[PDB]
């Protein structure tokens, strides 16, 4: 099976996901899945064609497990890992505002998304963070956006220039 | 005791005061700019009066369609190539109209002045209207036209092809993903002002020339709503002018917005006009220089110079590449005809003369190639030939720009032939220009869009088409075709026989 | 000239024959129903479903999506153009919702358009017939100009609460319903102002400036908790479903209904006010129209979702409890308004009874749908503590 | 087929070619304004006038006609199709009239169609928002079902009085206005029944039959003198103008405006009834609409005729006197209805307040236009003699 | 608390009880019948619902007209002959629609049953709509057409010619002057059922054949309201079927009605279609037999048999005079062209062939005459020739039926040639048929209509035209013309130079 919307990889993960029935286990796997398969800093590009869909499936399980495990207050204010959502938000924002350059900034924003994206962090706190983090990141990035020559920007990013054509 | 009442402007007089102050009365979206608290809107409307002026327009519009136009059998008496073009034109526009809804809701959230908010609000409702209008155009051509397939399921069959990916960049993601202002520049300042407003109009011209009276009826009505949006866009700039950040960022965001849109429309609109029509209206080349250079990149853009706005620094390159872009693209569009949801056609003899006349050198390059493909039997199902094969034989790989999603064949193109390939964290990326490259190098996490080769890798052609429902109601005939005639239409099996299997061209690089 | 310069393909003999010649002998496909692949909510596919469902290019990773792959361009940081992360709710398909009224743009602006003109005629008949002669001056100058006038800010606030949802909604059908629910609120706020400006025209000295009503809203007591709840619903909620749910299935179903129906609409008569009831009837129709969509979306599609039914009800139960308190507080502050009425206007029994009417309808129409355990006596008494 | 066997000259290449050949190089006359010879009432000629003025084929012998000669076929006996002999009134031109609202068929049904749709919505929300709850059983089941219901016959009768005028009107402008005045009246009667019908759907034992109110109208004593006035205005007047005049500028300006506004409109609130008021609302607007036309025809046009000013006024002051009595008699009898209201519902000071309002407006909008000196006190006094 | 409302059918159920009995609750019009007071109408409508179904129709209609049709320049791309024809067709139908208002008002007054009164009332409103719709057709062609004169002032210019007199007999006086029931028959049972309804649709046919998409858009909409009127007329017969007087008078008025309506439409209609168009649709003889014989006189009338309705005893006589009726009339119409408000065109080679093919013997009579007239220069102003002169030369007197007002020429006609002349109390009277003769002998006071010869007697042609504004804007060129070309238009002086004076042809018997 190698389909676009239905294939073996997705099926295998669906089965893996059904065998999660503890919030702590399911949450840890979602955070791990994200470090392993999302953003351009993913540990591997092996699931590039199915990670998006698979991740949603894993999220679905972490959400259902969190709603049954948490009381109403914790659901509105704690991360799936038991941290105080607001403390995480403020702390991360604090780190962002103290970032020296746009390179430190991107690591802080992307790192935040891989670790706290819902159902880990309640969406209210998460989107509020998206709002603040994104702002600084753009402020640092869009400053003098064309002053660095492509030759150098490639070095700064750290790509392996494989081929060019003038 | 004389008959009196209240109109829209009398209530609008106090609209601005509706918003009040409180700690968290602030935008929910990230942004480098601060939209001024006292910004004002141009049109003094309220919900009730807005509804009345649109309801009136609808009457005329639907009245025409349901009555006179239907009796005249206008849904049929349209040139085949144009019936197919509207499948793309209308559905693709539909998505731009749709995302503009979410786009203007994001601007309404950004705006702090009740009047600026209200200005965007009107557009929010206009875009819903526009979404439903474009939907109707396809709904109408499906129920009454010479070929409903494509018109009746574009919303799912458009996902098969590569031109769809690029449309989502400029008309979907480009409108809603980014700094609220960057989105406004993509959608309004550049989008509507430079391309769409002039485009909606031009389409009714080309439409009229090819026997289509259905599209002018609807689009001309869509066109009456653009004044407010042009205004909204203009005001976005005004609302951020007296802000320090505007000086450090505005021009950078405008430049990126300009290149983003231009990258897709320059080649695609020109392609739809000249290759998707029988009767030509005007050579795309001059249409462009008038729109982009004169009207927009001079007149409209210069009127905004008083606010620190400058001419796009990439305008020169855009111009340099423009000339052959659409011709280079139709070659790829036709070669990959089995991936569309529309039927294509080779330029006929009369068209080749027009292309050569208006584009000296057209024949020596594209002309001869199209002539070799028909010789190879590209129009014939039994030939067992698809232009794609010619590309493999002559070693002309086709890549997908990781940023704009626009397909390009650098070894065969007469226009831009640049190609940049990079490796980063175990992934390969292909770029066709220097502007798109900076965008990625600087904003990697924003452009992780997987292309058709990556998604379809290892899959046999007919299997991809089948999975994604690229068939007609007979369940065997392809929606897409390499000719617009009514006989000898290819079937899934004619493709299965070719046994073509997708492979990622970037993999060849060590 | 008389025939013009541009030659059209449908009427130009030469061009028309070229076109007619290229035409196939018959349609290349006999399936002429656009949207034929969409699962009908009713007997047959409707023009509303045909023109609306799937306009949103969601990939399959957003429940119900038909497309595939990541967005082409995302926000700095990586946030997707649209994604599961913008709301706590989960479903099997974000495209399941159907506005029971099947409203797409054309029908929506057409009814509002009708109402606009009917409103215009109504006022002209009202002033010409000199019906203003019957309205009590104090009810007109204090309660309508100041208190009903302040409520326009409440409705404006509820309107703005919809902004994020217009941008974040995960489907076309929800986006349209959401957009129409919001537009209806800004319309009501505007009708409140439309009435004041009308009075300013037919009543000497009547000031239409919003300074008074607005001063009431931002600094008075009657609407203090009301404004706090509204400010919260609008700017402290980043989840588009919590916002639409809490506003319509909690705050406005309780506070709004009480203020509009149990206070103003119920007392206007006793003061010869036949003007305000007119606009309140619109707001009430609007409330009724929106409710049907709200119920379908949150109870029929999400509350009864085959896979997340239990999860979603827990979340909406959570939201009801989170917002029921501020709403009770809003009602409680509003009780201070009765003490301002001329003596003998109404009594504690009538007030209590109307409170039970609003609370009982809410339990039946909303609370029960998600098994939220609401104690009607507890709610009402918590509110009555506000009666001075 | 897909193309259709029938060929059309606009799109058929061959036929169109022939047509294009026969066309002139330009219009054969630059005057492209239909009705360019009509004397505008306003700045520029209106669509309303162009499409209406002179449609009636009258010859010059019928004041204002443009045709010549006699009719081609007349009545057995010699009676002309339309002759100056069908009305006492005289004028320089029967086409001088102009409906201030400039309603030709399209606008007319448009505005009314909107009201019909609005009416449907309103009624729906009214029941969905359970506003019926607040209404008083006695008022509902008694004053509305029986006395408001019986008023539908009053309205139906005024409608029927228009029949002959629809045949004898001497100009297109007066015919369209007359048709529309009458058509609104039948509308009112139907709306009265529409309510009795609505209630019968939301209230268990309510009977929508016309049995009760019809009996009240044909036998009761409250409308007895009204019913007689109606039977006279309808079947005893053969002069189309006397009919329209006496019906709109006398009988309905008094009795009608009182029963509708001063009684049912005024009291409805005091019984928790905001339903009937919605319909009496449409009725009052319709009254205002006709009034503007009635004023233009009988005052601006006839009563102010450059050659028959003095003459017509005399004739109208005559009809006013002729019918001002039967009207009063209709009102007096109606006063006896108050004695049926629950004690305290309303004192005598109020009915007198309303009685003077009605009479005062009827002197400001009608009697003082032909100079019919009337005593507001004497008139009210006479009506008042009808209470307990 | 479930959302509820009430509909038209639910309020109409109690509509019959609306009327109450009393003293003088009787019709104010003379009649020999007694319409049953328990009579029902077929459609359960209340004012507000009627308003809605009509408003919806207007939307489609006016939208098509203001939007698409205007954009296609529909008011222009129509054949000249047809443009002139619609001046008559539209405005003449207009008066019929108009008098129909008074007609149904008089019938509404006649009915005693509330339901029957209600049905008539709906027609009263429909008729008002049709008056306005027909007015709109002329209004539209005036504003956007190739020749506004006539279209723009037909309400006054129509008074110059003799064809108008005949129109008033069947669409004005015949609809309102007389026994309420006799009028009904003229209007509904015969007019609408046998001629108008079929013709309304036929018009759209001939209209579309000649490039007119305007008329179809409006007339087809009118057509949709006809079913009600068919019902009213039908219920009228029912209402009186029982009354003994019915079996003693019905058939008489019905015969007189039929003869009255066919006496005009038979000639005029066929003439308007065959001579006022370039492209033909169907020979009028065939169309006539199907309508007047099968459809009406057969099907329709048959269903009214169980109510004592017998086929018109004048039916046979009608089919006899019919065949050449319209051809005979156009000769007269063209010869008297200066008295119209429209431009006429003589048959071209194709049409003459079409005419000969469909009417064997046509050329040898009509054809040769038109060629003589043309060769003599009836189309050229400088020839000084007007066909009326040819009638005098060859002594072919033209008379006007004192009853039907229809023009006839006994010594020339290929159809009926009978002519009866009488003198009474000092007045001469001319009849063209036995039925009309009876009507006059029996009811002298009903027919005292001065004909064009009596009224214009002694006047010089150009003077009659000038006094009645038969001129175009320039005040010199005549609204009427003997050809439909753009050049060489006849002026008032070209007419005065001929110095023709009117004469009462009956005096030749003195
Ligand atoms: Ca490698
Ligand atoms: Ca307080
Ligand atoms: Fe748009
Ligand atoms: Fe736009
Ligand atoms: Fe008619
Ligand atoms: Fe009719």
From Swiss-Prot, chain A:
InterPro entries: Me_mOase_g, Me_mOase_g_dom1, Me_mOase_g_dom2, Me_mOase_sf_g, MethMoxGammaMmoZ
Pfam families (alphabetical): MeMO_Hyd_G
Reaction(s) catalysed by this chain's protein: methane + NADH + O2 + H(+) = methanol + NAD(+) + H2O; methane + NADPH + O2 + H(+) = methanol + NADP(+) + H2O
Entry superkingdom: Bacteria
Keyword list, A-Z: Monooxygenase, NADP, One-carbon metabolism, Oxidoreductase
Record-level Gene Ontology MF annotations: methane monooxygenase [NAD(P)H] activity
EC number of the protein: 1.14.13.25
Enzyme class: oxidoreductase
GO BP terms, alphabetized: methane metabolic process; one-carbon metabolic process
NCBIfam families documented for this protein: MethMoxGammaMmoZ
Quaternary organization: M.capsulatus has two forms of methane monooxygenase, a soluble and a membrane-bound type. The soluble type consists of four components (A to D): protein A, comprising three chains, in an alpha-2, beta-2, gamma-2 configuration, is a nonheme iron protein containing an unusual mu-hydroxo bridge structure at its active site and interacts with both oxygen and methane.
Function: Responsible for the initial oxygenation of methane to methanol in methanotrophs. It also catalyzes the monohydroxylation of a variety of unactivated alkenes, alicyclic, aromatic and heterocyclic compounds.
Name under which the protein is recorded: Methane monooxygenase component A gamma chain
UniProtKB/Swiss-Prot annotation, chains B, E:
Pfam families noted in UniProt: Phenol_Hydrox
Residues at the catalytic site: 134
Cofactors required: Fe cation
Catalytic reactions on record: methane + NADH + O2 + H(+) = methanol + NAD(+) + H2O; methane + NADPH + O2 + H(+) = methanol + NADP(+) + H2O
Classification via CDD domains: AAMH_A
Cofactor: binding details: Binds 2 iron ions.
GO molecular function: metal ion binding; methane monooxygenase [NAD(P)H] activity
Top-tier EC class: oxidoreductase
A GO BP annotation: one-carbon metabolic process
Annotated InterPro entries: Ferritin-like_SF (IPR009078), Phenol_Hydrox (IPR003430), RNR-like (IPR012348)
Entry-linked SUPFAM superfamilies: Ferritin-like
Binding locations of Fe cation 2: 192, 226, 229
Keywords, sorted A to Z: Iron, Metal-binding, Monooxygenase, NADP, One-carbon metabolism, Oxidoreductase
E.C. numbers: 1.14.13.25
Domain of life: Bacteria
Residues noted as binding Fe cation 1 in the record, renumbered to the chain: 97, 127, 130
Family to which this protein belongs: Belongs to the TmoA/XamoA family.
Subunit structure: M.capsulatus has two forms of methane monooxygenase, a soluble and a membrane-bound type. The soluble type consists of four components (A to D): protein A, comprising three chains, in an alpha-2, beta-2, gamma-2 configuration, is a nonheme iron protein containing an unusual mu-hydroxo bridge structure at its active site and interacts with both oxygen and methane.
Function description: Responsible for the initial oxygenation of methane to methanol in methanotrophs. It also catalyzes the monohydroxylation of a variety of unactivated alkenes, alicyclic, aromatic and heterocyclic compounds.
Name of the protein: Methane monooxygenase component A alpha chain
Upper lineage: Bacteria, Pseudomonadati, Pseudomonadota, Gammaproteobacteria, Methylococcales
Swiss-Prot record, chains C, D:
Gene Ontology BP, a term: one-carbon metabolic process
EC nos: 1.14.13.25
InterPro entries referenced in this protein's UniProt entry, alphabetically: Ferritin-like_SF, MethMoxA_beta, MP_mOase_hydro, Phenol_Hydrox, RNR-like
Keyword Plastid: no
Organism domain of life: Bacteria
Subunit organization: M.capsulatus has two forms of methane monooxygenase, a soluble and a membrane-bound type. The soluble type consists of four components (A to D): protein A, comprising three chains, in an alpha-2, beta-2, gamma-2 configuration, is a nonheme iron protein containing an unusual mu-hydroxo bridge structure at its active site and interacts with both oxygen and methane.
UniProt protein name: Methane monooxygenase component A beta chain
Organism: Methylococcus capsulatus (strain ATCC 33009 / NCIMB 11132 / Bath)
UniProt lineage: Bacteria, Pseudomonadati, Pseudomonadota, Gammaproteobacteria, Methylococcales
Gene name tied to this protein: mmoY
């Amino acid at each position: 099976k190698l389909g676009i919307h239905s294939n073996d990889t997705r099926d295998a993960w669906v089965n893996k996901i059904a065998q999660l029935n503890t919030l702590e286990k399911a949450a840890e796997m979602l955070k791990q899945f994200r470090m392993d398969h999302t953003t351009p800093f993913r540990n591997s590009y092996e699931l590039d064609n199915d990670y998006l869909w698979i991740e949603a499936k894993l999220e679905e399980k972490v959400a259902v497990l969190k709603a049954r495990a948490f009381n109403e207050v914790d659901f509105r204010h704690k991360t799936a890992f038991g941290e105080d959502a607001k403390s995480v938000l403020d702390g991360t924002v604090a780190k962002m505002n103290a970032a020296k350059d746009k390179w430190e900034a991107e690591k802080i924003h992307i790192g935040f998304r891989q670790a706290y994206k819902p159902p880990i962090m309640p969406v209210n706190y998460f989107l509020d963070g998206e709002r603040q983090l994104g702002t600084r990141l753009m402020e640092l990035r869009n400053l003098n956006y064309y002053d660095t020559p492509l030759e150098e920007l490639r070095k700064q990013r750290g790509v392996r220039v494989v081929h060019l054509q003038s | 005791r004389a008959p009196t009442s209240v109109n829209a402007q009398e209530v609008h007089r106090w609209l601005q005061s509706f918003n009040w102050d409180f700690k968290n009365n602030r935008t929910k979206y990230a942004t480098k700019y601060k939209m001024a608290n006292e910004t004002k809107e141009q049109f003094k409307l309220i919900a009730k009066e807005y509804a009345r002026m649109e309801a009136v327009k609808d009457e005329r519009q639907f009245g025409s369609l349901q009555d006179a136009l239907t009796r005249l059998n206008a849904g049929v008496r349209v040139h085949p190539k144009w019936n197919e073009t509207m499948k793309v034109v209308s559905n693709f526009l539909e998505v731009g109209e749709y995302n503009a809804i979410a786009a203007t809701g994001m601007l309404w959230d950004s705006a702090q002045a009740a009047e600026q908010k209200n200005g965007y609000l009107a557009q929010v409702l206009d875009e819903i209207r526009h979404t439903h209008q474009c939907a109707y155009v396809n709904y109408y051509f499906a129920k009454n036209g010479q070929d409903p397939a494509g018109h009746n399921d574009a919303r799912r069959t458009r996902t098969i092809g590569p031109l769809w990916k690029g449309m989502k960049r400029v008309f979907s993601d480009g409108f809603i993903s980014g700094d609220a202002v960057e989105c406004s520049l993509n959608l309004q300042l550049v989008g509507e002002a430079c391309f769409t407003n002039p485009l909606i109009v031009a389409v009714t011209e080309w439409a009229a020339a090819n026997g289509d009276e259905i599209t002018p009826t609807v689009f001309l009505s869509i066109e009456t709503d653009e004044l407010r949006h042009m205004a909204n866009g203009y005001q976005t700039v005004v609302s951020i002018a007296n802000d320090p950040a505007s000086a450090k960022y505005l021009n950078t965001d405008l430049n990126n917005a300009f290149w983003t849109q231009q990258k897709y429309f320059t080649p695609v609109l020109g392609m739809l006009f000249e290759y998707g029509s029988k009767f030509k209206v005007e050579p795309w080349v001059k249409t462009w220089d008038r729109w982009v250079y004169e009207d927009w990149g001079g007149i409209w853009i210069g009127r905004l110079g008083k606010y620190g706005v400058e001419s796009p620094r990439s305008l020169k390159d855009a111009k340099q590449d423009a000339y052959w872009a659409h011709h280079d693209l139709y070659l790829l569009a036709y070669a990959l005809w089995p991936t569309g949801f529309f039927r294509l056609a080779l330029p006929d003899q009369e068209e080749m003369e027009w292309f050569e006349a208006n584009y000296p050198g057209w024949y020596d390059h594209y002309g001869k190639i199209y002539e070799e493909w028909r010789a190879r039997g590209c129009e014939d199902p039994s030939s067992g030939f698809i232009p794609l094969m010619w590309f493999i034989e002559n070693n002309h790989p086709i890549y997908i720009d990781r940023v704009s999603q626009v397909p390009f064949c650098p070894s065969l193109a007469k226009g831009a032939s640049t190609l940049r390939v990079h490796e980063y964290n175990g992934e390969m990326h292909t770029f066709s220009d220097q502007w798109g490259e900076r965008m990625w190098l600087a904003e990697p996490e924003r452009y992780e869009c997987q292309n058709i080769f990556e998604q379809y890798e290892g899959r046999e052609l007919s299997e991809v088409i089948a999975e994604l429902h690229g068939l007609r109601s007979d369940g065997k005939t392809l929606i897409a075709q390499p000719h617009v005639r009514g006989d000898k239409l290819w079937t899934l099996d004619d493709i299965k026989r070719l046994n073509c299997v997708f492979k990622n061209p970037v993999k060849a690089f060590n | 000239s008389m025939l013009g310069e541009r030659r059209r393909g449908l009427t130009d003999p030469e061009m028309a024959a070229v076109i007619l010649k290229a035409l196939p002998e018959a349609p290349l496909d006999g399936n002429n129903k656009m949207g034929y692949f969409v699962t009908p909510r009713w007997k047959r596919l409707t023009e509303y479903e045909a023109l609306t469902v799937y306009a949103q290019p969601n990939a399959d990773w957003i429940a119900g999506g038909l497309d595939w792959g990541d967005w082409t361009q995302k926000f700095h940081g990586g946030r997707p153009s649209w994604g599961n992360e913008t709301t706590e709710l989960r479903t099997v398909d974000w495209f399941k919702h159907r506005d029971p009224l099947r409203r797409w743009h054309a029908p929506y602006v057409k009814d509002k358009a009708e109402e606009w003109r009917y409103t215009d005629r109504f006022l002209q008949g009202y002033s010409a017939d000199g019906q203003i002669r019957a309205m009590n001056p104090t009810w007109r100058d204090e309660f309508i100009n100041r208190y009903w006038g302040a409520f326009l800010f409440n409705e404006y606030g509820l309107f703005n609460a919809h902004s994020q949802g217009a941008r974040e909604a995960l489907s076309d059908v929800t986006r349209v319903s959401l957009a129409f629910w919001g537009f209806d609120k800004i319309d009501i706020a505007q009708m409140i102002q439309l009435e004041r400006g009308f009075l300013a025209k037919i009543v000497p000295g009547f000031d239409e400036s919003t300074a008074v009503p607005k001063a009431e809203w931002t600094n008075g007591e009657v609407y203090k908790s009301a404004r706090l709840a509204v400010e919260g619903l609008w700017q402290e909620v980043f989840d588009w479903n919590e916002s639409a749910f809490s506003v319509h299935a909690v705050y406005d179903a309780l506070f709004g209904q009480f203020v509009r129906r149990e206070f103003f609409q119920r007392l206007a008569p006793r003061f010869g006010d036949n003007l305000t009831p007119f606009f309140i009837n619109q707001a009430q129709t609007y409330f009724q129209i929106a409710k049907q969509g709200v119920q379908d979306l949150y109870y029929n599609c999400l509350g009864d979702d085959p896979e997340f039914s239990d999860y979603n009800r827990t979340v909406m139960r959570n939201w009801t409890g989170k917002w029921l308190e501020p709403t009770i507080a809003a009602l409680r502050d509003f009780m201070g308004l009765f003490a301002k009425l001329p003596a003998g206007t109404t009594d504690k029994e009538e007030i209590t009874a109307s409170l039970y009417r609003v609370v009982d309808d809410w339990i039946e129409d909303y609370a029960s749908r998600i098994d939220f355990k609401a104690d009607r006596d507890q709610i009402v008494k918590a509110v009555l503590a506000g009666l001075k």
